[PDB]
Design an enzyme around this catalytic site. Structure first.
Site, PDB file in Angstrom:
ATOM      1  N   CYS A 190       0.802  -1.239   0.000  1.00  0.00           N
ATOM      2  CA  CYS A 190       0.000   0.000   0.000  1.00  0.00           C
ATOM      3  C   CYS A 190       0.828   1.279   0.000  1.00  0.00           C
ATOM      4  CB  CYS A 190      -1.037  -0.008   1.146  1.00  0.00           C
ATOM      5  SG  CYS A 190      -2.004   1.504   1.246  1.00  0.00           S
ATOM      6  N   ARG A 212      -0.104   4.548   2.666  1.00  0.00           N
ATOM      7  CA  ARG A 212       0.093   4.401   4.107  1.00  0.00           C
ATOM      8  C   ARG A 212       0.424   5.665   4.924  1.00  0.00           C
ATOM      9  NH1 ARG A 212       3.944  -0.568   4.683  1.00  0.00           N
ATOM     10  NH2 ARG A 212       4.466   0.058   2.525  1.00  0.00           N
ATOM     11  N   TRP A 238      -9.415   6.174  -0.632  1.00  0.00           N
ATOM     12  CA  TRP A 238      -9.762   6.840  -1.881  1.00  0.00           C
ATOM     13  C   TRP A 238      -8.753   6.382  -2.944  1.00  0.00           C
ATOM     14  CZ3 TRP A 238      -8.440   9.607   2.560  1.00  0.00           C
ATOM     15  CH2 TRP A 238      -7.117  10.108   2.598  1.00  0.00           C
ATOM     16  N   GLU A 245      -5.341   3.562 -10.724  1.00  0.00           N
ATOM     17  CA  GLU A 245      -6.088   2.336 -10.476  1.00  0.00           C
ATOM     18  C   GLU A 245      -7.297   2.262 -11.425  1.00  0.00           C
ATOM     19  OE1 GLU A 245      -6.341   1.130  -6.227  1.00  0.00           O
ATOM     20  OE2 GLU A 245      -6.057   3.283  -5.852  1.00  0.00           O
TER      21      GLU A 245
HETATM   22  C1  HEM Z   1      -6.369   6.359   1.832  1.00  0.00           C
HETATM   23  C2  HEM Z   1      -6.093   6.240   0.512  1.00  0.00           C
HETATM   24  C3  HEM Z   1      -5.431   4.960  -0.034  1.00  0.00           C
HETATM   25  C4  HEM Z   1      -4.782   4.907  -1.200  1.00  0.00           C
HETATM   26  C5  HEM Z   1      -4.540   6.084  -2.187  1.00  0.00           C
HETATM   27  C6  HEM Z   1      -4.312   3.543  -1.366  1.00  0.00           C
HETATM   28  C7  HEM Z   1      -3.601   3.085  -2.453  1.00  0.00           C
HETATM   29  C8  HEM Z   1      -3.343   1.776  -2.746  1.00  0.00           C
HETATM   30  C9  HEM Z   1      -2.877   1.262  -4.008  1.00  0.00           C
HETATM   31  C10 HEM Z   1      -2.617   2.151  -5.274  1.00  0.00           C
HETATM   32  C11 HEM Z   1      -2.700  -0.067  -3.824  1.00  0.00           C
HETATM   33  C12 HEM Z   1      -2.218  -1.166  -4.810  1.00  0.00           C
HETATM   34  C13 HEM Z   1      -1.417  -0.591  -5.999  1.00  0.00           C
HETATM   35  C14 HEM Z   1      -2.325  -0.438  -7.229  1.00  0.00           C
HETATM   36  O1  HEM Z   1      -3.528  -0.784  -7.127  1.00  0.00           O
HETATM   37  O2  HEM Z   1      -1.849   0.025  -8.308  1.00  0.00           O
HETATM   38  C15 HEM Z   1      -3.088  -0.390  -2.476  1.00  0.00           C
HETATM   39  C16 HEM Z   1      -3.039  -1.641  -1.894  1.00  0.00           C
HETATM   40  C17 HEM Z   1      -3.417  -1.997  -0.615  1.00  0.00           C
HETATM   41  N1  HEM Z   1      -3.837  -1.134   0.413  1.00  0.00           N
HETATM   42 FE1  HEM Z   1      -4.105   0.859   0.144  1.00  0.00          FE
HETATM   43  N2  HEM Z   1      -4.635   2.819  -0.235  1.00  0.00           N
HETATM   44  C18 HEM Z   1      -5.414   3.609   0.565  1.00  0.00           C
HETATM   45  C19 HEM Z   1      -5.972   3.216   1.768  1.00  0.00           C
HETATM   46  C20 HEM Z   1      -5.896   1.983   2.378  1.00  0.00           C
HETATM   47  C21 HEM Z   1      -6.615   1.564   3.569  1.00  0.00           C
HETATM   48  C22 HEM Z   1      -7.607   2.414   4.403  1.00  0.00           C
HETATM   49  C23 HEM Z   1      -6.241   0.309   3.839  1.00  0.00           C
HETATM   50  C24 HEM Z   1      -6.703  -0.593   5.001  1.00  0.00           C
HETATM   51  C25 HEM Z   1      -7.003  -0.108   6.228  1.00  0.00           C
HETATM   52  C26 HEM Z   1      -5.324  -0.107   2.802  1.00  0.00           C
HETATM   53  C27 HEM Z   1      -4.666  -1.324   2.702  1.00  0.00           C
HETATM   54  C28 HEM Z   1      -4.163  -1.854   1.534  1.00  0.00           C
HETATM   55  C29 HEM Z   1      -3.887  -3.258   1.298  1.00  0.00           C
HETATM   56  C30 HEM Z   1      -4.007  -4.456   2.286  1.00  0.00           C
HETATM   57  C31 HEM Z   1      -3.377  -3.356  -0.119  1.00  0.00           C
HETATM   58  C32 HEM Z   1      -2.925  -4.675  -0.826  1.00  0.00           C
HETATM   59  C33 HEM Z   1      -4.155  -5.282  -1.522  1.00  0.00           C
HETATM   60  C34 HEM Z   1      -3.885  -6.637  -2.155  1.00  0.00           C
HETATM   61  O3  HEM Z   1      -2.875  -7.349  -1.847  1.00  0.00           O
HETATM   62  O4  HEM Z   1      -4.723  -7.031  -3.017  1.00  0.00           O
HETATM   63  N3  HEM Z   1      -5.087   0.947   1.956  1.00  0.00           N
HETATM   64  N4  HEM Z   1      -3.401   0.757  -1.824  1.00  0.00           N
HETATM   65  C1  LIG Z   2      -8.275   0.337   0.403  1.00  0.00           C
HETATM   66  C2  LIG Z   2      -7.676   0.528  -0.978  1.00  0.00           C
HETATM   67  C3  LIG Z   2      -7.647   1.795  -1.559  1.00  0.00           C
HETATM   68  C4  LIG Z   2      -7.083   1.944  -2.834  1.00  0.00           C
HETATM   69  N1  LIG Z   2      -7.046   3.163  -3.395  1.00  0.00           N
HETATM   70  N2  LIG Z   2      -6.624   0.861  -3.517  1.00  0.00           N
HETATM   71  C5  LIG Z   2      -6.654  -0.393  -2.979  1.00  0.00           C
HETATM   72  C6  LIG Z   2      -6.116  -1.577  -3.761  1.00  0.00           C
HETATM   73  C7  LIG Z   2      -7.236  -2.163  -4.623  1.00  0.00           C
HETATM   74  C8  LIG Z   2      -6.858  -3.181  -5.700  1.00  0.00           C
HETATM   75  C9  LIG Z   2      -7.874  -3.993  -6.245  1.00  0.00           C
HETATM   76  C10 LIG Z   2      -7.611  -4.935  -7.254  1.00  0.00           C
HETATM   77  N3  LIG Z   2      -8.636  -5.679  -7.738  1.00  0.00           N
HETATM   78  C11 LIG Z   2      -6.305  -5.092  -7.777  1.00  0.00           C
HETATM   79  C12 LIG Z   2      -5.276  -4.287  -7.234  1.00  0.00           C
HETATM   80  C13 LIG Z   2      -3.835  -4.400  -7.743  1.00  0.00           C
HETATM   81  C14 LIG Z   2      -3.661  -5.712  -8.539  1.00  0.00           C
HETATM   82  C15 LIG Z   2      -2.266  -6.029  -9.072  1.00  0.00           C
HETATM   83  C16 LIG Z   2      -1.118  -5.243  -8.826  1.00  0.00           C
HETATM   84  C17 LIG Z   2       0.096  -5.649  -9.380  1.00  0.00           C
HETATM   85  C18 LIG Z   2       1.356  -4.830  -9.150  1.00  0.00           C
HETATM   86  C19 LIG Z   2       0.154  -6.811 -10.176  1.00  0.00           C
HETATM   87  C20 LIG Z   2      -1.010  -7.564 -10.413  1.00  0.00           C
HETATM   88  N4  LIG Z   2      -1.004  -8.702 -11.182  1.00  0.00           N
HETATM   89  N5  LIG Z   2      -2.167  -7.150  -9.834  1.00  0.00           N
HETATM   90  C21 LIG Z   2      -5.559  -3.344  -6.211  1.00  0.00           C
HETATM   91  C22 LIG Z   2      -7.165  -0.572  -1.684  1.00  0.00           C
HETATM   92 CL   LIG Z   3     -10.285  -0.915  -8.408  1.00  0.00          CL
END
Ligand code: HEM
Ligand SMILES: Cc1cc(N)nc(CCc2cc(N)cc(CCc3cc(C)cc(N)n3)c2)c1
Ligand SMILES: [Cl-]
Ligand code: HEM
Ligand SMILES: Cc1cc(N)nc(CCc2cc(N)cc(CCc3cc(C)cc(N)n3)c2)c1
Ligand SMILES: [Cl-]
Ligand SMILES: [Cl-]
Ligand SMILES: [Cl-]
Ligand SMILES: [Zn+2]
Ligand SMILES: [Zn+2]
Ligand SMILES: [Zn+2]
Lengths: 407, 411
Positions: B108, B111, B280, B285
């Site tokens: 993430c 963070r 958000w 994304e």
């Molecule tokens: C507040 C604004 C936030 C933003 C902008 C954000 C952004 C992102 C992005 C960009 C990714 C994955 C990279 C991608 O999709 O390209 C991600 C993954 C993740 N975030 Fe955040 N995040 C936010 C909030 C949170 C919150 C509130 C939580 C939990 C309390 C969280 C926990 C995680 C987790 C566990 C992943 C990994 C998901 C997975 O393995 O599928 N994030 N975040």
């Molecule tokens: C709470 C929160 C807020 C926020 N803004 N964004 C998220 C993550 C959401 C998320 C959702 C999906 N379905 C896939 C990915 C990456 C999927 C992925 C990444 C990479 C690097 C390789 C691959 N194969 N797939 C991220 C969570």
């Molecule tokens: Cl999404």
């Protein structure tokens, strides 16, 4: 023991069995992944020799043959006697091609079998080195129609008679610190440029000065040589639609030639082994032109495009980055100099990887380097799971010689 | 041991001591790095050390380590484990745990915000109707008329593994996907399988390109139930482009609230199988993944056509050009409608500031470079040249299998 890799775009799943031949360390443990860290005796030598000769003999369908066994004994004999051994030409060409085959950071490996190996193990002086290099440069360049090559100088002996090319690439631009505080030319080469001057080079003090070669034969002090300018093919950079682009004064060289790595074959160490291929467009347009510690021209290009640079959210940096990369590709193509764009290179690599999976059982790949430094997600490698492990023969990093050489 | 990471743009070197607290595995060994592999009931025996570990961390954070309150809490938990096989977290511990699972989320980039997470304690919930109410509340609060607030909602913990709370949706809000007979897909191809379940469960599909899916909710291991989120609670943004007037006529829109609801929260050894959390969006994304993945809405070709780019050869970089324009559109649309969004430059810049501060104060910041580096323009962001160490700290968010794969149906 059988490892699965999935492609998240195509749902295709592949099984790696080749990893069980991995040998060197990754840097990772069960507790910590170092996947994004850039750098994570007679008794020792025979196992390495055997391991290599076994793979060589297996590869020509002669495993366990008398000819196989006889070579194992011969090399064993020569190690016992001389503490080292010499590779047959056939072994050298196999070992070099396979070091490229095994380079997990290289997207261009589809080409690995077509490498031209120049054996320079008879070289004894820096002048001799210079000759081998000009010859490699001319052959690889080929008036723009680039061919892959490597030139292999004599192997390490006691480690105090090392051949080294002190340059990090055969062709690269000087970097100079100015009274101003800014940097003229390539900031990456500032240090190497100072050693060149310390050694006696008359620097032209310009923006794109091809550095001289600084060559070390047989552990002796290194020597300066200017590559014949007529052998260094350069491309002025223009854009197919922006007339003002040319005025930025930009050019780059056609031949990418890495010259600071070490080639390991059968435990033998080739500390000077420059190798070259051709560029993927993003190497020049993203890394060389746009890294903050490099030519760093994003700001100036965005300004000429009259983009709104008030807020990052306008994606001005991104717009400019594309157009810079468009111009690089356009300029190499217009001058008929081989270049590959990242869509084409990564598509080719995915084809290579599937080929390797069926024929070899796997293809070590380092996602951090294989995915291009722009538009990663829209290339077929982004969604491809990769396994990264070290096979030998290999190319390895080694420390810069000035930190080690004793004068 | 101390571990060094370097930034290859700034030469700044940082030292990691936090990795010494690492637990679970990475998937990696000294022979194989699995850094790019997406995915590589507890006994009293294993549970008390997990709880102790957690409570020692908790009491440290509050500057009460070794206190009477600390020791009384260890003993109280110990005996509850002895006699009930499990234990209950205090509300304070739950809040702390949830915030830390985010802080420890190595994939993430968002963070920097970890400490401002609104935690909704839903451990009193007993039914799917109760879950639906909790979730609408979470959605309304988080959405905040476009001024988005991070939030998580925490349902009861796993007991015997037969009584799980699960949100069958992978996100609270997502669009339906429908496989047509001719083999095309209408709407979002990522959600075809789930859409089909919903329909089978009795959902009347509108069959459009942007149908908000119903929630499918399982309480106490019972069969899941269907609920439609009130449309007035689902904030959506019509996608348009600041210079190209034909962009609106692509008919694109997206929802403002990213809300992951298929992960598992682990705190002190306890497992919270239903813990939807939201923040958000970073613009990429939507503009890179959701719109331009070939396995998703896949609009690159259509956009490039409309822009009249040279599509004869990849080397005009037509795909890159269209990619940038679409992402420009997404950020412009969100900003104009005053819905919180962050561009990838600002997000990664904030992340680097976060990460360095985490090194100073915490001794590290586990990070997964593969996910942290944005899916376009990687190298011109300050994370690309940043070496990172990836390891797993608890509390944590984990993957769990899709529930239709393991659920025992009652009928
Ligand atoms: C507040 C604004 C936030 C933003 C902008 C954000 C952004 C992102 C992005 C960009 C990714 C994955 C990279 C991608 O999709 O390209 C991600 C993954 C993740 N975030 Fe955040 N995040 C936010 C909030 C949170 C919150 C509130 C939580 C939990 C309390 C969280 C926990 C995680 C987790 C566990 C992943 C990994 C998901 C997975 O393995 O599928 N994030 N975040
Ligand atoms: C709470 C929160 C807020 C926020 N803004 N964004 C998220 C993550 C959401 C998320 C959702 C999906 N379905 C896939 C990915 C990456 C999927 C992925 C990444 C990479 C690097 C390789 C691959 N194969 N797939 C991220 C969570
Ligand atoms: Cl999404
Ligand atoms: C034929 C054209 C070639 C292409 C297009 C190419 C492409 C690339 C690229 C793009 C990278 C690094 C990622 C980046 O710069 O963004 C790389 C790394 C590398 N390649 Fe190639 N390559 C080619 C030929 C070769 C040859 C001929 C060899 C050796 C015989 C080689 C061995 C390596 C090695 C060892 C690395 C890693 C370098 C390091 O760790 O710093 N490649 N290649
Ligand atoms: C033979 C050959 C042909 C060809 N076309 N290209 C090459 C690679 C040359 C190369 C040279 C330098 N100085 C840096 C990098 C990446 C440096 C890098 C990459 C990543 C992913 C992160 C980081 N910090 N640094 C690659 C070799
Ligand atoms: Cl380069
Ligand atoms: Cl770089
Ligand atoms: Cl993805
Ligand atoms: Zn690893
Ligand atoms: Zn770079
Ligand atoms: Zn994707």
């Amino acid at each position: 023991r059988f490892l699965k890799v999935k492609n998240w775009e195509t749902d295709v799943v592949l099984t790696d069995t080749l990893h069980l031949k991995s040998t060197l360390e990754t840097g990772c443990t069960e507790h910590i992944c170092m996947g994004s860290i850039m750098l994570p005796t007679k008794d020792q030598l025979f196992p390495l020799a055997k391991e290599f000769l076994d793979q060589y003999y297996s590869s020509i369908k002669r495993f366990g043959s008398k000819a196989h066994m006889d070579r194992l004994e011969e090399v064993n004999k020569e190690i016992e006697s001389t503490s080292t051994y010499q590779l047959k030409d056939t072994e050298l060409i196999y070992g070099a091609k396979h070091a490229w085959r095994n380079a997990s950071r290289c997207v261009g490996r589809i080409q690995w079998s077509k490498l031209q190996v120049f054996d320079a193990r008879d070289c004894t002086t820096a002048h001799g080195m210079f000759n081998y290099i000009c010859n490699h440069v001319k052959y690889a360049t080929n008036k723009g129609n680039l061919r892959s090559a490597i030139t292999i100088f004599p192997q390490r002996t006691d480690g105090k008679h090392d051949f080294r090319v002190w340059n990090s690439q055969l062709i690269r631009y000087a970097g100079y610190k100015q009274p101003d505080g800014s940097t003229l030319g390539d900031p990456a080469n500032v240090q190497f440029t100072e050693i060149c001057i310390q050694q006696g080079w008359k620097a032209p003090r310009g923006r794109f000065d091809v550095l001289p070669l600084l060559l070390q034969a047989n552990g002796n002090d290194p020597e300066l040589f200017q590559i014949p300018p007529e052998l260094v093919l350069e491309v002025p950079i223009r854009h197919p639609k922006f007339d003002w682009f040319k005025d930025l004064g930009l050019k780059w060289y056609g031949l990418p030639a890495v010259s600071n790595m070490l080639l390991e074959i059968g435990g033998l160490e080739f500390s000077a082994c420059p190798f070259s291929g051709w560029y993927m467009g993003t190497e020049i347009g993203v890394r060389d032109y746009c890294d903050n510690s490099r030519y760093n021209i994003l700001e100036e290009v965005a300004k000429k495009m009259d983009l709104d640079m008030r807020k990052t959210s306008s994606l001005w940096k991104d717009q400019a980055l594309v157009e810079i990369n468009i111009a690089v590709l356009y300029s190499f193509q217009s001058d008929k100099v081989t270049i590959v764009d990242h869509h084409s290179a990564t598509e080719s690599f995915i084809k290579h990887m599937e080929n390797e999976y069926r024929c070899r059982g796997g293809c070590p790949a380092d996602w951090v380097w294989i995915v291009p430094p722009m538009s990663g997600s829209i290339t077929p490698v982004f969604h491809q799971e990769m396994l990264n492990y070290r096979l030998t023969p290999s190319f390895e990093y080694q420390p810069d010689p000035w930190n080690t050489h004793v004068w």
